[PDB]
Paper text:
As phytate is rapidly hydrolysed by wild-type [name], our efforts to capture crystallographic snapshots of its complex with the substrate by soaking crystals with InsP6 were unsuccessful. This was the case even at pHs where the enzyme retains minimal activity in solution, yielding only the structure of the orthophosphate (product)-bound complex. Utilizing this structure as a proxy for the enzyme in the covalent intermediate state, the structure of the wild-type enzyme with InsS6 as representative of its complex with phytate, and the structure of the complex of the enzyme with orthophosphate as representative of the complex with the second stage product, we can now build on previous descriptions of conformational changes occurring during catalysis to describe snapshots during the complete structural catalytic cycle of the enzyme. Notably, the involvement of R20 in stabilizing the phosphohistidine intermediate and its interactions with bound orthophosphate in the product complex explain why loop opening does not occur until after loss of the second stage product. We also observed a conformational change in the sidechain of E219 on binding of the pseudosubstrate inhibitor and found this water site conserved in the structure of the complex with orthophosphate.
[name], the [name] periplasmic phytase of clade 2 of the histidine phosphatase (HP2) family, has been well-characterized and successfully engineered for use as an animal feed supplement. The [name] periplasmic phytase, [name], is a 1D-6-phytase (EC 3.1.3.2) and initial hydrolysis preferentially liberates the phosphate at the 1D-6-position on the inositol ring. HP2Ps catalyse the hydrolysis of phytate via an obligatory phosphohistidine intermediate. The catalytic proton donor is found in a second, short, conserved motif with sequence HD positioned such that the aspartic acid residue functions as the consensus proton donor in the catalytic mechanism.
Residue numbers in the entry: 5 to 410
The structure:
Amino acid sequence: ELKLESVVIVSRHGVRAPTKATQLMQDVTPDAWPTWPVKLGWLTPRGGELIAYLGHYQRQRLVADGLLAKKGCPQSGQVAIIADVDERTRKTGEAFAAGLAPDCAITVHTQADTSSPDPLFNPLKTGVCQLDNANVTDAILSRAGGSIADFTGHRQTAFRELERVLNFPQSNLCLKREKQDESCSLTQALPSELKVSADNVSLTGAVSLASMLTEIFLLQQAQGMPEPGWGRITDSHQWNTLLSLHNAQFYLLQRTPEVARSRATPLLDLIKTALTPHPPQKQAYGVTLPTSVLFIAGHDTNLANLGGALELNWTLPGQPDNTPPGGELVFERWRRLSDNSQWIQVSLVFQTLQQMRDKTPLSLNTPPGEVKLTLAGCEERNAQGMCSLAGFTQIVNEARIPACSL
Ligand SMILES: [Mg+2]
Ligand SMILES: [Mg+2]
Ligand code: NI
């Protein structure tokens, strides 16, 4: 028997409109990209509704776990929400509060200035710290198989799948090539290189374009749009093949520990603060920690960074995107009653693509997907695979980068 004492949820924001619409995306397909109901990068109403489903589900299961009351609003900081400054993250926090505790108006805290980046969600972005250029380069290239040419060489079945969905042979980038005595290939038409600077890593060309476009197809599906990918994505094998290109870029750029440890350090500190038993104390964002429930509205990069830094690996059954809209990395502190010891469990909770496509209300009898994770570095584990509080504490202390803390 274990008793749930605390939960921290790091969530990607919900479904949002594509953040840019470029000439290159026009040039790789003869077809017209469907337009979205909100501004570039904003949360869609359906995106908010899907988040509220997770909030409602989390209320049900946390009531069943005895952590929140069945009726009424949580009292005095029992639930806290922090969100990145972006509209889509702020609105994700509002949607989660609306599902978790409807009509309770739980405050969605942000940093003071909502017009500039919050270093909690990436300390490299405000120059708190810097990447190690040489070491990051070598690390990403090794994980790519030794070169980006080697990386794309194995993924060419998936690139051909993307070309079919695009009808790439009939695109402007194809047809305006000269001459035509040569076949059309995304990877060869758009050579891909790794670019590393003190504040960012990125991939150029086909690799980054493919990661973006396959995510757009998935967002079209989750948004309920009539025919994602111009109706040329027709079974789950095709979805899994397409999104493998997106997961592969995040594996290189955001999971690689030489990037992830730095980029995740502020979130590691906040998470460890929320999970550690201590007298309640007002801290960052004016939130009092520890408390019962902390929900943090961030981004796919944050999920990937935390997984890379903590050595948490996952694939999501029925959800082709490893870092899907509204995907939740769920940290829990459990007290084992046999000796009143403290234990940390980590999970990935997510809506399957069909649960998004169908706008399926979630509940105890229709739950989201959930993957139980293990901290690979943990040396002190209980019968349920949880890491001891002290073991988890050492892992975070070893994984974090002190220069990157706030
Ligand atoms: Mg339970
Ligand atoms: Mg406040
Ligand atoms: Ni993703």
